[PDB]
């Protein structure tokens, strides 16, 4: 997360870290939507150009109070996966359209103060919350600064990072780039004349974009961090996978 601040303890009990088994390394973010189900981004597992295609044998998922720079053992659960379901119509080729994947844990996890699922939007919840200007929240353990060249200095969060970012109107999203955006994605972030900054960066993808409902006091995952051109560049916005659009595929998979 670029231009974010340290997350308070317990701020995001649905946060999940997708790791590489050996050598261990953070590959992306994820969210916990049930005690067996984990939501993340398809590119985090399958991106053919980079000969990328992980199996449940080369991945692990960490859940709970990690407050990074340590294996929080007691407040953190490491889990193996059972299966991965990558949306059938995922398009790695052009714009990473339908960038969604489901990870089914090997075993149901024991919830706690630090482990707890987030809600999936519903017809009306989406209806009231998804408007331009309304602010969502991104969380991750990725780089604090665009490591294009290398930017090896800093960029290593010892505590989870939060950034609340506004939803940007569709036509602005589209005119910000020469890439084709489908109704399967939305963009979010600050416009140049707004002064504030913030974006997700390398290592944050797959993670949650959530919004709190004033009608019930609940947090709903509205999007998944998918892509953007660079991190926190002026005139550019981060792109998210529209969880509600593909809410139906997530249902067919668990039924």
């Amino acid at each position: 997360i670029v231009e974010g601040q340290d997350a308070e303890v317990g701020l995001s009990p649905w946060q999940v870290m997708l790791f590489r088994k050996s050598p261990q390394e953070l590959l992306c973010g994820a969210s916990l939507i049930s005690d067996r189900w984990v939501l993340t981004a398809a590119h985090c597992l399958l991106y053919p150009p980079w000969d990328k295609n992980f199996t449940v044998d080369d991945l692990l998922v960490r859940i709970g109070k990690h407050s990074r720079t340590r294996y929080e053992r007691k407040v953190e659960k490491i889990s193996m996966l059972d299966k991965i379901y990558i949306h059938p119509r995922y398009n790695w080729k052009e714009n990473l359209d339908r960038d969604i994947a489901l990870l089914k844990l090997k075993r149901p996890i024991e919830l706690s103060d630090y482990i707890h699922p987030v809600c999936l939007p519903d017809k009306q919840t989406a209806a009231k919350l998804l408007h331009a200007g309304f602010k969502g929240r991104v969380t991750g353990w990725g780089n604090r600064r665009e490591t294009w060249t290398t930017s090896v200095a800093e960029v290593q969060p010892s505590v989870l990072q939060v950034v609340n970012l506004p939803l940007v109107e569709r036509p602005v999203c589209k005119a910000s780039t020469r890439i084709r955006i489908t109704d399967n994605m939305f963009c979010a972030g600050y416009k140049p004349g707004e002064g504030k900054r913030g974006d997700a960066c390398e290592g944050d993808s797959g993670g949650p974009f959530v919004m709190k409902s004033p009608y019930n006091n609940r947090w709903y995952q509205m999007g998944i961090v998918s892509w953007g051109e660079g991190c926190d560049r002026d005139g550019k916005y981060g792109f998210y996978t529209h969880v509600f659009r593909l809410k139906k595929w997530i249902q067919k998979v668990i039924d």
């Binding site: 601040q5 308070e8 303890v9 317990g10 701020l11 009990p13 649905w14 939507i33 049930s34 706690s112 103060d113 630090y114 707890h116 699922p117 987030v118 809600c119 999936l120 200007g133 309304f134 602010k135 969502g136 929240r137 939060v162 609340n164 506004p166 959530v210 919004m211 709190k212 409902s213 004033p214 006091n217 609940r218 947090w219 709903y220």
Partner: peptide, 29 residues
């Protein structure tokens, strides 16, 4: 599912996090 999105350390405790009001403000704006 069910009791989703209510955090054990905030919602369940009637405690609002540090950056929460910023989101609400964006709503009623």
């Amino acid at each position: 599912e069910a009791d989703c999105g209510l955090r054990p350390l905030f919602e369940k405790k009637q405690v609002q996090d540090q950056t929460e009001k910023e989101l609400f403000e964006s709503y009623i704006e």
